[PDB]
């Protein structure tokens, strides 16, 4: 029968992201001679809130080294950053917090975040809120580094690609109970139309594959192939094991 | 006719239990009654202090 | 330790607490020493550090934060900068 809620989120329309009040992307500084070879110094002009994001950001202003012009960025705030602090970054950057330097430089056991997945990408892994990666180990030839991500996975990475030292700010957000449905409503409203979520068991059998029945039951196994046409792929996708 | 009756209400009249509908706090709010008092007693205290009646430490 | 020697200075010696007053003490050329808390603003410190250099005066960076120093002067308030004009009978000045 129907195209199911889920198939519909792909068309955008109503399920697009809410992004009026969002303060910008939360990138790293782009690479250049100064970053590449020395270290450019900038100052943290302010620390900011960014709707739909648990991490706070940091307006960090540098000086463009070509035009007389004060360029500025939005770093995700490393925890313990503050205003009127300087934020050095580059190869020859000093290994202290809120200081973006290549993973290859920094020693083993070094905690980082906003870490570039591929060199020059401007900060992709570990940029959530209480999250960080740890630099495991370096292979000097091949110019590669092994990094342990917050998911647990131990991804291999180019030693050139940068990261900000320290963890992300605003950690332990998810320790607080929400309590009020209202409090949930207010969270997702500054994000996207994804909240009060209706269980496919509730639905009639035209709008979901679990729907219908004289008793709210699933009726088929809730685990499912991932060679599964969009419209059935519902429940537990490719679920290797399923229980507790 | 009202003016006459308001003069009765001044004398303390048509004002007993059986001609009150509001709670006491609605009729005279406790907060306001408090605000008056502080603004009186405090004013009395700093007038005393600023005549050298009472010293700093007493005042405080 | 410095807390011990200060104790005696505060008891018996002459001194002055705070930046507005100690900069006036140095500027007079009476101040024989200047204690700075560690949390003091960086501009303030460097300014004071220069004023001592011009007036050939000792500058002792205190081990503690301005709350600790004020506690260490025997005051319930907090002092970031403190000048020691005349020590009483202490050897705070060496």
């Amino acid at each position: 029968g129907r195209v199911i809620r889920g198939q519909r989120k792909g068309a955008g329309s109503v399920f697009r992201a809410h992004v009026k009040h969002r303060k910008g992307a939360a990138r790293l500084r782009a690479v250049d001679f100064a970053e590449r070879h020395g270290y450019i110094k900038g100052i943290v002009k302010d620390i900011i809130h960014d709707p739909g994001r648990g991490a706070p950001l940091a307006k960090v202003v540098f000086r463009d080294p070509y035009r007389f012009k004060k360029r500025t960025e939005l770093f995700i705030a490393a925890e313990g950053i503050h205003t009127g602090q300087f934020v050095y970054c580059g190869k020859k950057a000093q290994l202290n917090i809120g200081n973006v330097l290549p993973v290859g430089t920094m020693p083993e056991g070094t905690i980082v975040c906003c870490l570039e997945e591929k060199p020059g990408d401007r900060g992709k892994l570990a940029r959530a809120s209480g999250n960080y990666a740890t630099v495991i180990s370096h292979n000097p030839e091949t110019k590669k580094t092994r990094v342990k991500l917050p998911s647990g996975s131990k991804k291999v990475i180019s030693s050139a690609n940068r990261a900000v030292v320290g963890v992300v700010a605003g950690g332990g957000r998810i320790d607080k109970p929400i309590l009020k449905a209202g409090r949930a409503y207010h969270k997702y409203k500054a994000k996207r139309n994804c909240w009060p979520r209706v269980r496919g068991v509730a639905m009639n059998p035209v709008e979901h594959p679990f729907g219908g029945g004289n008793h709210q039951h699933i009726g088929k196994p809730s685990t499912i192939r991932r060679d599964a046409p969009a419209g059935r792929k519902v429940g537990l996708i490719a679920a290797r094991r399923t229980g507790r | 006719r009202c003016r006459k009756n308001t003069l009765a209400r001044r004398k303390g009249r048509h004002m007993g239990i059986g001609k009150r509908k509001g709670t006491a706090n609605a009729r005279m709010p406790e907060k306001v009654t408090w605000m008056r008092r502080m603004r009186i007693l405090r004013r009395l205290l700093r007038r005393y202090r600023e005549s050298k009646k009472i010293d700093r430490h007493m005042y405080h | 330790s410095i807390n011990s020697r200060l104790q005696l200075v505060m008891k018996s010696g002459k001194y002055v607490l705070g930046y507005k007053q100690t900069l006036k003490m140095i500027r007079q050329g009476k101040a024989k020493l200047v204690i700075l808390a560690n949390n003091c603003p960086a501009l303030r410190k460097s300014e004071i550090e220069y004023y001592a250099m011009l007036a050939k005066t000792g500058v002792h960076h205190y081990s503690g934060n301005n709350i600790e120093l004020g506690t260490a002067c025997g005051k319930y308030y907090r002092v970031c900068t403190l000048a020691i004009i005349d020590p009483g009978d202490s050897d705070i000045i060496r």
Binding site: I81, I97, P107, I111, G130, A169, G170, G171, G172 | - | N66
Partner: protein, 91 residues
């Protein structure tokens, strides 16, 4: 325990939400509204502005910290490690 035996901050919520949740909220609900000490001036004015961002009113030093505390433990432990390694590298 002048007014309440054992709800305090979370007496606002009344009966609602269950005992465990309300006990669980009391920890955070306190810490997040606490006024901490600005390690910059030393006044007791570090006050959470929004999640992860704490502002001294006097110092005017906005400070990226934890969600419900000026410092997470994680942040603190990470700080010391980085300081140790920094010293190990440079000597």
């Amino acid at each position: 325990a002048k007014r309440t035996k054992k709800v305090g901050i979370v007496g606002k919520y009344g009966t609602r939400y269950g005992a465990s949740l309300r006990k669980m909220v009391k920890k955070i609900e306190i810490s997040q509204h606490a006024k901490y000490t600005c390690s910059f001036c030393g006044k007791t004015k570090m006050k959470r502005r929004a999640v992860g961002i704490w502002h001294c009113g006097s110092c005017m030093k906005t400070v990226a910290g934890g969600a419900w505390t000026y410092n997470t433990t994680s942040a603190v432990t990470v700080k010391s490690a980085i300081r140790r390694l920094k010293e190990l590298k440079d000597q």
